[model samples]
Structure formats: structure tokens, C-alpha cells
Target: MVKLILVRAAESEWNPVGRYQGLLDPDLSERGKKQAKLLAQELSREHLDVIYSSPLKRTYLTALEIAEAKNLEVIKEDRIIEIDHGMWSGMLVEEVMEKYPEDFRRWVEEPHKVEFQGGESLASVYNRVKGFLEEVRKRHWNQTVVVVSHTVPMRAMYCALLGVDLSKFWSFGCDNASYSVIHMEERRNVILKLNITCHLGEFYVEA
Candidate 1:
């Protein structure tokens, strides 16, 4: 069995502002930086084989702190990259809908049919992540690994594990810096714990 530890990157400057990060790299906000610090400290509880992270700065940087403490190196994986938002990249989500209503609705209401102007479709993301799963499976079974990734990929993963369609994807919300745990063996996935925050408090300030 693969003990998979999923750590969503801590809150970023864009997360609280409701902006579309979509493959656009944003540094962790002050609170976001602090969030990672605390998370790294808490995750110190686990003895991990390796730490995997999106090549994006947000997660890579966040995972770095934990890697440093654990004496492990951060392994970059493109599969965890944020969804390519295409024209929506860097635009405030509200502004995107106002200017591109048709595209917006199609993305949400009919996700499979939708692909970003210069990006990917939900199905495309699924294919990539599924490939990532295959890679992880082939390399490391019966190992505990930590992964820090973006929101959309995280949501798609949860949906994939649940045998659900991506159309119902938004039903699962992935807050920045949120933490969840899942275990995978061959093709079977058991979500032991998800979206846990009891270990963090409101005073958790970011740098």
C-alpha cells in the first residue's frame, strides 16, 4: 500500500483575494508562509520517504520548508501543476465571468466540453494525473510519500478516487494549505482522513 500524504499549498496571496492563479505562480501570502511553517512543523510527525511537489513556486516553496526539516529534497512533478486558466489566467474570477460569460458557463455547466483557450480540459487533467498515479505506483509502493499540489488537481484526484465524474468537482472545496490523507494500493484508494484543520488555529499567521 502506498501511504499518500496530500498537503495543499498554504494560502497564497491570490487565494484570499479570489483571483485565478491558474498556472500563474503566486508566492505564499504572509499568512500563507506562516501556514507552511506550521504545517511543516506538524508534518514533522510523519516519517516520509520523499516529498513531491508541483513545479510551481507556491507548492515547491512550501514543501521546501518541510523537506529541509526532514532532510529530504523536494521532488518536482508537473502533474501537480495548477490548471492552465488560459485567458482567465491572472484575471479576477468575477471579471472573467463578466467579460467571458459563455466560456465561464461552459466551464462550469459542461466541463468536459470546455478547454481553456491555451490550456486543458477536465479530461485532459484526469489523463495527466492518472499517468502520474501510474508513475507513483511503479516507483513507490508500500511507501509513505508527501505531495504538495494546487487546488484543481487535488479536487480532480479526490473525484477520481471516489469514482465520480468531474462535473461534480466543485462540490469539493480545496482551501489553500489545507491537508488531507489518502492511501493507495494498486488501483484501490482509501481516503483515511481528509481536509483536516484541527491542528491549526486562527492565530496561525503567515509571513
Candidate 2:
């Protein structure tokens, strides 16, 4: 069995404003930088064979921290990039709530059916992440790998691991700079841990 440490990128500039980052690139927040350092220290003790990142600034920076500690290079994976928000990419939550109220409502209530304006669907993301996992399993069988990704993609991965549908997307959430450990055996996935943030004892990190 291979262990996959799914890390949600630490807080980004948009996180505190409740903005939709989608595929838009942004750097980590101040607290996120600190969390990255702590997370690097924490994971430095683990046995990791490979490190993968979503190719975004926030996630790549976080991966860099761990990579510097582990003396490993990060492999960028396009499939794990954040969902494309299209028209909603830079909009704030309040703006979306005011402008696209029904659409936003549907997204919150029935995410499986939400397809951002000129953007991707939940099913599309699920499929992308599914393919990504397949590659991870095939390329690094029986190895421990770390994946630095954003909230949406990480959430979709959780649903895939649990054998749940995309409609249950919000069934759970991972905090900034937190990670979940999933063990993959054959074609099945077992989640050993979820949202472990003990490394960040007291500091506040925005979601």
C-alpha cells in the first residue's frame, strides 16, 4: 500500500477575503508562510519518496518548504490544479452572493450540478483528480508521496477516497496548511487521518 499525504495549501491572499481563486495564482499569506515552515518541520521527520504540487504559487510555495527540508524537488501536476472558476475567479463571496445568488445557492446546496460560467463542473474535477490518483499509484507504488493542492481539488479527492459522489463535496473541509493521510491498496483507498493540524498549535490560519 502507498500512503498519500494530501495537503491543502496554506492560506492565500484571497482566503481571508472569501474570494474565488479558481486557477488564479496567489502567494501564501503571512500566517501561511509560518504554517509552511512548521509543516515542513513536521513532515521532515516522515519518510516521503516524492512530492507533487498543483503548480500554483500558493501550493508550490508550500511544497517548496517541505522540499527544502526533505531535499527533494517538487513535480508539478496539472491535473491537481485548482478548479477553473471562470467568471467567478476574482469575485468575492459577497459579490457572488449578490450577483449570482441562485447559482451560488445551487453551488452550496447541490455542488454536483454546479458548472461555473465557462468553467469546470464538479464531475470534471472529480475525474481529473481520479486520473491524477491513478498516475500517483502507478508511478509511485508502495511509496509515500505528498500532494500540495488547493481546497476544491483536495475536497474532491476526499470524496473519491470515501467512494462518495461529488454532490457531497462540502460534506467535509480541510483547514489551511492541514493534511490528510490516505493509504491506497490495489484499487481501493483507505483514509487513515483527516485534517491533522496539530503542527499548527496556536496560530490562526484563514481558510
Candidate 3:
């Protein structure tokens, strides 16, 4: 009876611009705020037990609105934060491409094994998330939990839950305010939904 809902932070400035936000922090844009508010209204009607989120500003702020409306405390899970992009944190995609083309190519080609100059590798991000996943499964076997996180960790989690190869994580997409759900039972995990943004229609930017 365990239910898990994972959501990406809504349309940030970086999101619409195709900027690489690895660990650089940014708040929600006006559209993002409205989207989250709409999303919160939708979630308020449901029966939600607890809320969890990454400490990053975007994730925390987005999840906070829902948790506050529901009168619940969101436990910030640091492990669920986005991967630290290190030297490339604030750099744009073209900058990364222009400055470190080989490294950027490696990151795009083989994410699982590639590590940035001062950033974390996909495997490193997966390692911590894997441990957290196991613990959450054991602790909340029959409860509904909402996790709000960034793209890297959320995408990686989707891969692990689906038992897919880590190298293909790049293929997974997590747009702003998108939702994915999984039901973890004694047998096998059942996917209730994947990458949905029903609340957002023609409001936000689409890339």
C-alpha cells in the first residue's frame, strides 16, 4: 500500500532557457509560482500523508506551498538534491560546450561513468539516492509520500525504480511541475503514472 509521488520543480528561469541548473540555485519564476499554486490547489483535495523535498530553493519552495496548505511539515531530504555540477554550476549549456567540449560530450554521451572536473558523477548521485530509496521503502511501507526534487536525482530515481540501465538516464525527461507516481508493494513496483502535468495547460513555456 505504499505510494510515492515525485515532482519536478515548476518552470524556473533556467528551465525555459535550457540552462544547466545542476546545483546552481534559483527561485521559481512568476509562472512557476502560479503553476505551483495551481498544483497545490489540486493536491489539497487529495489525501496526502507527508511531504518530502530537496533543500534546494526551487524544490523546497514548491513543496512548501502544498505542505503548508495541508498543515504538514515537509522534511527536507538533502540526499534528494540535484547533483553538484561544480565548476559548471552557473555556466550555460553553450558555455559548457564551448569551454569543455570533450568533457561536455562525455557527460552527454556517458553520464553514468562521466564525472565533471569538480562535480559529481551519475553513479555518485545514484549511490546516495539508492540508499535513501531503500530506507524510505522500509519506513513507509503503507503510506503515501510526496517527494519534490530536481531533474538529476528524480531522473535517476526513475531509472532505478524501472530497473533500467543507468547509462540511459539521459533518455528520461522531467519537465517543470511534472508528476510521476509509483506504488511499491511486496511484489513488484507498479507505475501508476509517469511524467504528467495535468494542471499546467497553456500557461508555461514549453521547450
Candidate 4:
């Protein structure tokens, strides 16, 4: 059995501004720092064996908080990185709608069907997340592991773990600085928690 603690990185500079972060690198916002600290304090009591994070600054920094609290080193995992938004990266939500109206509409209504022009498809993200989980199940037994990553990948992780269709992607709500717990065993996979945010309190910033 493996206890998987999946965390979405705290708010980034682009999050409040409503920009499509995609693969672009951006550090955590001021409020995000506070949120990360609170999250670390909340998980300080857990017996964590390892921590993994996306290489992006936002996720890396968020993982750093918990890693410091637990005295663990964070292993960077490229497979858990954020989805590539292609031309939509760094563009505002309104801008993307104006520039690519049809694509944008499809994205909101039928996200599983719309692949970014230069970015990854939702299915691709699901595959990578699934691959990562497979490795974790094979390597870690009766261990507690923390994975810090972006919204899209984290959402995909939920779907992968729950054995659900990728079309239900938006069905999972991944708030910034939120943590979800999943227990993986040889016979069954159980979700202990989903999108927990009591730690953030006033520092909680909506995505």
C-alpha cells in the first residue's frame, strides 16, 4: 500500500491575473507564500517518506515548504509537470477567447476534444500522469509520498487514480494550495480526501 498526497501548487503571479500559465515558468505570488507555509504546518505531523514536485518554480517552491517542514528532499518529476497550453500560454482568458473563439469555446465545453495548437492534448496529460502513478505503485509500498504539481496535471492525476474518463477532467476541482490524499493498494485504490483547504484559511486564494 502507498499513501499518495497530491498537492496543487499555491497561487502564482499568473493565477490572480487570469492568465493561462501552461508551461511558462512563474514564481508564487505573495499570498501564495503564506498559503504554502500554512500547508506545510498542516502536514508537518504526517510521516512522509518522500516528496516529488514539478520543476516549475511555483510547484517547486510549494514543495519546498513541505519538504523543509518534514526534512525531506523534493525529487523533480517532469511527468507531473503542467499541461502545455501552446499559443495560449501567458495569454489572458479573454484574450484567448477573442483570438481563438471556436477553440476557446470548445475548450470550455468539450475540453477533452480540443488539443492546443502547439501544446498537449488532455489525453496526453492523462497518459503521463497515469505513467507516473504506475511507477509509484511499483516502487513505493506502505509509504507516504507527496506530489506537488500544477492544476491540469493534478486534475489529471485525480482522474487517473479514480479510473475515470478524461472527459470528466473538469469534474474535479483543484484549488491552489489544496491537498488530496489517495491510498493505493494491490487490490484497490481509495481516495481519502479531495481538494482539502482548511490549512490555507484567510490566505486561500481562489484559482
Cα lDDT computed for each candidate against the true fold: 0.81, 0.89, 0.83, 0.90
Clashing pairs in 4: none
* Model 1 TM: 0.91
Q: Model 1: C-alpha RMSD to truth? A: 2.4
TM-score of 2: 0.96
Candidates 2 and 4: which is better by TM-score?
4
Q: lDDT score, residue 174, model 3?
A: 80
Screening candidate 2 with a backbone cut-off below 3 angstroms (N, C-alpha, C), the clashing residue pairs are: none
The candidates, ranked best first by lDDT, are: 4, 2, 3, 1
Write one digit per residue (lDDT tens) for candidate 2, span 1-207: 889999988889889889999999989989889989999999999888999999999999999999999989999999899999989999999999999999999999998888999789888999999898888888888899999998888889988877888877898768889988999888689989988999998864535
| TM-scores of all predicted structures | 0.91, 0.96, 0.94, 0.97
Give, for candidate 2, the lowest lDDT window spanning 10 residues: 198-207
**Model 3 whole-model lDDT (C-alpha atoms):** 0.83
RMSD of each: 2.4, 1.2, 1.4, 1.0
Q: Name the candidate that leads on TM-score.
A: 4
